[PDB]
Amino acid sequence: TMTDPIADFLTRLRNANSAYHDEVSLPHSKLKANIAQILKNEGYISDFRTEDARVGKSLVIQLKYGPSRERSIAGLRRVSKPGLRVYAKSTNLPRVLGGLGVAIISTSSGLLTDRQAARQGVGGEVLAYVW
Amino acid sequence: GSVIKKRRKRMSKKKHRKLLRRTRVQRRKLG
Amino acid sequence: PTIQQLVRKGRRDKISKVKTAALKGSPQRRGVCTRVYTTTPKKPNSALRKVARVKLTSQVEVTAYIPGEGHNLQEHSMVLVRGGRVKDLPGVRYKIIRGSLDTQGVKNRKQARSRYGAKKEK
Amino acid sequence: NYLERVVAINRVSKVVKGGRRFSFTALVIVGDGNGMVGVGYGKAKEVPAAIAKGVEEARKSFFRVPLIGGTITHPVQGEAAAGVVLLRPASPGTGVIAGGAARAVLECAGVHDILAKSLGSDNAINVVHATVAALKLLQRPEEVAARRGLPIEDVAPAGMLKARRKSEA
Amino acid sequence: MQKTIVVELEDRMRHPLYGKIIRTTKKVKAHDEDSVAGIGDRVSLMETRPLSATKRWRLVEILEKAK
Amino acid sequence: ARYTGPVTRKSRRLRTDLVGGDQAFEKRPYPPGQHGRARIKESEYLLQLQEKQKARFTYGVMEKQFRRYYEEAVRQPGKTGEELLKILESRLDNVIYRAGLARTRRMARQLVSHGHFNVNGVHVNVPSYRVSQYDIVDVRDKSLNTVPFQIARETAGERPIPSWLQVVGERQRVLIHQLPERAQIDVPLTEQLIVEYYSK
RNA sequence: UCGAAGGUGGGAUCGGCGAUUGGGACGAAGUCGUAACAAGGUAGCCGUACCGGAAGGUGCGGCUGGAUC
RNA sequence: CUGGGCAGUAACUGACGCUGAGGAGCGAAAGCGUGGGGAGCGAACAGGAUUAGAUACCCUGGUAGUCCACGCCGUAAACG
RNA sequence: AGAAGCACCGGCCAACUACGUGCCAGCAGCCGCGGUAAUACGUAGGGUGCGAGCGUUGUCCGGAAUUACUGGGCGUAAAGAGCUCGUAGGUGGUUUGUCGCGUUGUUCGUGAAAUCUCACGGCUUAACUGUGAGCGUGCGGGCGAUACGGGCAGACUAGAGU
RNA sequence: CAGCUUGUUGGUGGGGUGACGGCCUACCAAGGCGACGACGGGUAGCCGGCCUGAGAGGGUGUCCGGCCACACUGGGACUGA
Ligand SMILES: [Mg+2]
Ligand SMILES: [Mg+2]
Ligand SMILES: [Mg+2]
Ligand SMILES: [Mg+2]
Ligand SMILES: [Mg+2]
Ligand SMILES: [Mg+2]
Ligand SMILES: [Mg+2]
Ligand SMILES: [Mg+2]
Ligand SMILES: [Mg+2]
Ligand SMILES: [Mg+2]
Ligand SMILES: [Mg+2]
Ligand SMILES: [Mg+2]
Ligand SMILES: [Mg+2]
Ligand SMILES: [Mg+2]
Ligand SMILES: [Mg+2]
Ligand SMILES: [Mg+2]
Ligand SMILES: [Mg+2]
Ligand SMILES: [Mg+2]
Ligand SMILES: [Mg+2]
Ligand SMILES: [Mg+2]
Ligand SMILES: [Mg+2]
Ligand SMILES: [Mg+2]
Ligand SMILES: [Mg+2]
Ligand SMILES: [Mg+2]
Ligand SMILES: [Mg+2]
Ligand SMILES: [Mg+2]
Ligand SMILES: [Mg+2]
Ligand SMILES: [Mg+2]
Ligand SMILES: [Mg+2]
Ligand SMILES: [Mg+2]
Ligand SMILES: [Mg+2]
Ligand SMILES: [Mg+2]
Ligand SMILES: [Mg+2]
Ligand SMILES: [Mg+2]
Ligand SMILES: [Mg+2]
Ligand SMILES: [Mg+2]
Ligand SMILES: [Mg+2]
Ligand SMILES: [Mg+2]
Ligand SMILES: [Mg+2]
Ligand SMILES: [Mg+2]
Ligand SMILES: [Mg+2]
Ligand SMILES: [Mg+2]
Ligand SMILES: [Mg+2]
Ligand SMILES: [Mg+2]
Ligand SMILES: [Mg+2]
Ligand SMILES: [Mg+2]
Ligand SMILES: [Mg+2]
Ligand SMILES: [Mg+2]
Ligand SMILES: [Mg+2]
Ligand SMILES: [Mg+2]
Ligand SMILES: [Mg+2]
Ligand SMILES: [Mg+2]
Ligand SMILES: [Mg+2]
């Protein structure tokens, strides 16, 4: 069945980014909203917002592309898995593309990326690498 | 030539069954 | 595959077959060296090869190659045997070191003169 | 003053009624030694003719390799037909470390500092195809920043930040 | 079994090489100065001096009784 | 142990004039032997091996000693080739070569081996000692009035003196300003191929 | 009383040898065929059953990793 | 007599889901047991032919089997 | 002036010509060489790599991403159970509040000494030693956190079922 | 190697011990362990470490140091902290 909507969301992102889709729609969960917030303020997508779905909430996000048809995301990868959870301390955080990409980190301070985790001093769950 | 891989197995199985039929009696039933 | 599968049954390495036997962790081992004779190699490389049936001090029996040319080995020479397998012969997997108790060094050896057993000169 | 290097010379054959018709394939890599590298396959009845054809069609298959001063910007893994080549940037001291087929391509590209590892097929041609694919996958901080909309300093790590200007003063 | 109680402990720990979280249980013995306890009985315990061959625990407080 | 053999032979084999001045070299720039003129196969391992042999026989350094120096150069922070050249320069026979108190390496080495040298007034006879910063490169007091030690005076002008050591007048004592880094190191050899070698 | 050793007994279990016998592998320029690869001369294979010096043959069902219109 | 599936309404429950080591059931054909049945076909078998031979292919017959009931078997290029 | 030998030279692998032998002797790790012109056997010369060491064996790791957590695969290359149901187990939609077990932050204690790494110091340098700083990844206590996972008390209908 | 366990699981009263304790004993109940591998078979001293490896891992436990076990083989007490 439907396991790990985090990976479902990022796989929807991959498939539509590879298909050059302007926008994606999916179910809304607070974790998805915060992941889309991270993706925004790290600059991998354009605006996202929410519909009044028939049930629940519906999360739509827009995919930004360069002036020509170049992907603004070069890929992405779920790292924390429901079959294998991966945790990282603040001193041994993952380095995505040596730094040119980022990793979504879940911490007691909420969801926040590699730079905030390193210079704020707490590590924890590593949901995914976007780059 | 993937059928050759089947023919080797066929020959080995055929010889084993032939040996069992040579010994379905006290030749092998005692043992 | 499905990491739960790995935790239920872990990755187990393939059995590494013992490359050398009859010596049981011994770099060399001596033998009474019965039945010296000469045998033929496989379908190519038609020649005649000097081999010896060695009763090793592991209380085993193996076939060994006599390297070099010439040997004084007949039936009961106390030989020292080490590894090394010849490609031509099927059952040869060991080699008597030349220059041991009752294996003299090969005569007229002036090149490489440590294998095959040889003092320099007089 | 412009580097060529041939990696593999392989004698192919075509079978006809009379017998076997032989030919030579000459995989060559042409490079400037700073950032310009191209790979040419090249085929001809004669070994130097195949060398020349490979050089001539490698010099028309060029692509820029993004470096930062002897090492690549970030680590990648190129996947060829069946070749897999993994590249990891190296500290400014330890030189090129690569296998026979990869080493030529990155030396012609002009990297001085790289960790290369062939994990997939061992065929030289597919190895160089995989390495080239990895160099395509390579990206620059200054265009990743344009890709993401954020400036240089908040996309590229401070290490490579301060390591860039140490070349050009 | 006559003033003896059996508490089935719980623990989760990181798998040493595959890194998963394995759920491992226990089955251990604790004291009851009063032999009243159903089946279930989320309860807490602390160590003692051994009161039998495999007695090392004591029931301290019983909460959310067996329903 | 030392090589104790021909020098121009290996200069020819390595295809580089290692020593300073050799008429025996440049007459037959090809490697010696009966097959001295054959077209050698320009292999990567080939030039790496000739290059490491260059690095060794330039300073008269033996194999496992060069190993040990390279395994501490790799471990030292930063880079490895610059520090490897640094330390192989810091060997005191090379120090004498830079100071100009010798004509060739094989007697720069022997002037140390034969005990004509105190560093901090300490009798040293091992040629592998490494000079530190600010140190004094001095001689025994009784060495004076000896033929090479007095021809060492007028032969101090034909060879330039590096800027990491200072040589003074009637007391033939050197002062090591600092441990020389990269540039003032004479470079008959490109040095990244040692670095590449030992990853094999 | 308990108690090592010892004795008695019946089992368990791990090995060695064994007349005789069975297959396997590797060898050589041996003997009998020609079963497969082409429609391989009856398409070939799978399971199963029976038969035959030997490859194999045949029946029943199946497959195309064969054909035909 | 009986199983499943699909669509629609949104009436109901409110995560009750997925998978599944072992395990259990089902499982072509052949085969096995007992009892029936047996037209046609048809392993085996026999004759004829072909052939150097022909333990085959082709022909003539033809037993088991193929069918039924109830058990057993539990295997197939059981394949997409 | 008393003081150098060892191994190897077809490709891996750095290092070649000649003579003697002629499927013989023999070499070899691999694939192969030698049947009258051998860079591959024996000798000579030369050379290469080393050097009080050089080679052979045996053992182990590496290369081997050829047990794959890092880091592999299963249509035809080895690999989907004949199919289904279902036990343990693994795993699990959306949302609210709480616990803080996992997770995570900090401190304290422990993690002996020696070993390994950094810096100096001395045995003539070195090997070796000493000192100071890391390592000691883990664990126990206290004080924080609740984003994710987990427990609990609930809620929803989107999955599932009626 | 799928069933192992009867002083075995627990309790009471005792004994015994330096000390808790089926450590032992009388009585009473019938429990405890196990597919997260009981019971069994084979192998093995363990460790900081050492070898290798980029690491994770793999091999190994020799000098040194720490812990344990043993002292011809097997069983037992004594003194004495
Ligand atoms: Mg084909
Ligand atoms: Mg692939
Ligand atoms: Mg491969
Ligand atoms: Mg009590
Ligand atoms: Mg017998
Ligand atoms: Mg045929
Ligand atoms: Mg046939
Ligand atoms: Mg025919
Ligand atoms: Mg046929
Ligand atoms: Mg059949
Ligand atoms: Mg028949
Ligand atoms: Mg049929
Ligand atoms: Mg409701
Ligand atoms: Mg099953
Ligand atoms: Mg059934
Ligand atoms: Mg039937
Ligand atoms: Mg029947
Ligand atoms: Mg029958
Ligand atoms: Mg009947
Ligand atoms: Mg018929
Ligand atoms: Mg007939
Ligand atoms: Mg019926
Ligand atoms: Mg099957
Ligand atoms: Mg079917
Ligand atoms: Mg070579
Ligand atoms: Mg000749
Ligand atoms: Mg030779
Ligand atoms: Mg070896
Ligand atoms: Mg491995
Ligand atoms: Mg190996
Ligand atoms: Mg594979
Ligand atoms: Mg699959
Ligand atoms: Mg297959
Ligand atoms: Mg299937
Ligand atoms: Mg189902
Ligand atoms: Mg199921
Ligand atoms: Mg369940
Ligand atoms: Mg659960
Ligand atoms: Mg959930
Ligand atoms: Mg000092
Ligand atoms: Mg020191
Ligand atoms: Mg120390
Ligand atoms: Mg310590
Ligand atoms: Mg529904
Ligand atoms: Mg009792
Ligand atoms: Mg009692
Ligand atoms: Mg008492
Ligand atoms: Mg033992
Ligand atoms: Mg590795
Ligand atoms: Mg010990
Ligand atoms: Mg010892
Ligand atoms: Mg004794
Ligand atoms: Mg006492």
TrEMBL record, chain E:
Domain of life (superkingdom): Bacteria
Segment forming the signal sequence: none
Family the UniProt entry places it in: Belongs to the universal ribosomal protein uS17 family.
Quaternary structure, from the entry: Part of the 30S ribosomal subunit.
Protein purpose: One of the primary rRNA binding proteins, it binds specifically to the 5'-end of 16S ribosomal RNA.
Name of the protein this chain belongs to: Small ribosomal subunit protein uS17
Species, as recorded: Mycobacterium bovis (strain BCG / Pasteur 1173P2)
Lineage: Bacteria, Bacillati, Actinomycetota, Actinomycetes, Mycobacteriales
